[PDB]
Design a binder for this molecule. Structure first.
Ligand SMILES: O=C(O)Cc1cccc([N+](=O)[O-])c1
Ligand code: NI
Ligand code: NI
Length: 257
């Protein structure tokens, strides 16, 4: 019964999941000067035209916007990836304050939040099977800074009062995730893991260099969510980020010079 606190936070997770101290854990700090430009990188293809959003769920640690992943409707390919990866959900990690919230850091800089678009490798047939493989998932990570509003985020922000507490869901159809992407698809990539229990080492991370801008008001609304279930004492859903983990024997590659 894990979480983000003093008593059950990241620094405790290893007792239940020894893989917490493994060789390819996420997130990491991205040292921009040491990431090497890789000319082998094939270009990134994000194909979201046919995406079908279904539902938004407060899962007790974040909220997930879920997609129909029963056909190739929203797929990631190219980049460092071999084969086709299907979008299943996106979520965010965020802070109690604008000065922290992202999981990845860039030369030790923390962003206010980070968006994760989660995709699974179609060669494994379903998400559950994919998470058991070293190349099972591809997560596209996008940093959020506070400034101008992101218009394409507002639909997400406005439904959050309907999913305040753990276990609540709401219909969330016709959402276009293209409206959450920055202009450039320049990226860093490295092999890593999920950043919550069970911490599976199944992720190819693709972290975009260009952040998106969201307004202070937008992020504030994220911070009104609750970790707790309805009828339990209120604990604001903030600081649901795992800190940077040791890079160990990995290299971060850049798609750009
Ligand atoms: O890495 C995370 O943000 C945690 C996490 C936990 C469970 C599933 C997830 N997913 O990638 O579908 C992600
Ligand atoms: Ni538990
Ligand atoms: Ni995540």
């Amino acid at each position: 019964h894990w979480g983000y606190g003093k008593h059950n936070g990241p620094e405790h997770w290893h007792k239940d999941f020894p893989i917490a101290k493994g060789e390819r854990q996420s997130p990491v700090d991205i040292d921009t000067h040491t990431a090497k430009y890789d000319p082998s990188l094939k270009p990134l293809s994000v194909s979201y035209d046919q995406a079908t959003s279904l539902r938004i769920l407060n899962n007790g640690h974040a909220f997930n916007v879920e997609f129909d992943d029963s056909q190739d409707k929203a797929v990631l390919k190219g980049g460092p990836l071999d084969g086709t990866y299907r979008l299943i959900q996106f979520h965010f990690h965020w802070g109690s304050l604008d000065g922290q919230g992202s999981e990845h850091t860039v030369d030790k800089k923390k962003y206010a939040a980070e968006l994760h678009l989660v995709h699974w490798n179609t060669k494994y047939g379903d998400f559950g099977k994919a998470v058991q493989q070293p190349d099972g998932l591809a997560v596209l990570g996008i940093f959020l800074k506070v400034g101008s509003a992101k218009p394409g985020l507002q639909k997400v922000v406005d439904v959050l009062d309907s999913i305040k507490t753990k276990g609540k869901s709401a219909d969330f159809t016709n959402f276009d995730p293209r409206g959450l992407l920055p202009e450039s698809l320049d990226y860093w990539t490295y092999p890593g893991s999920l950043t919550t229990p069970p911490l599976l080492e199944c992720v190819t991370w693709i972290v975009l260099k260009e952040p998106i801008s969201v307004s202070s008001e937008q992020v504030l609304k994220f911070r009104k969510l609750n970790f707790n279930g309805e009828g339990e004492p209120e604990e604001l859903m903030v600081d649901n980020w795992r800190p940077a983990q040791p890079l160990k024997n990995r290299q971060i590659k850049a798609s750009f010079k």
